[PDB]
Amino acid sequence: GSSGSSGLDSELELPAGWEKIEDPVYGIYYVDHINRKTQYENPVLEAKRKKQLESGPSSG
């Protein structure tokens, strides 16, 4: 695992089923009690990042 110096990541107004767990060794990570998944990349950012998309390649 890669330990980052700056960690300005947080819940960021998580949607639903998100829990910000702060650990001294594991660090700050969000756990989903719905998809039993845990990752560093905040969901609020991802969704709002791939959602803000106004125009893009249409496929269907």
Which amino acid would we find at residue 57? P
Domain count, the chain: 1
Q: How far apart are CA 46 and CA 49, in angstroms?
A: 5
**What are residue 28's DSSP bridge partners?**
22
> The tokens 């300005």 sit on which residue?
8
17-47 per-residue burial string, b: 16 or more CB within 10 A, e: under 16? ebeeeeeeeeeebbeeeeeeeeeeebbeeee
CB 59 within 8 A of CB 26: no
Distance set, CA 4 to CA 27, 43, 47, 53, 57 (Å) = 10, 19, 23, 28, 34
Residue 56 burial by CB count (10 A; 0-12/13-18/19+): exposed, middle or buried? exposed
For every residue of the chain, DSSP letters joined together read -PPPS------SS--SSEEEEE-SSS-EEEEETTTTEEESS-HHHHHHHHHS--S-----
Boundaries of domain holding 5: 1-60
Solved with: NMR
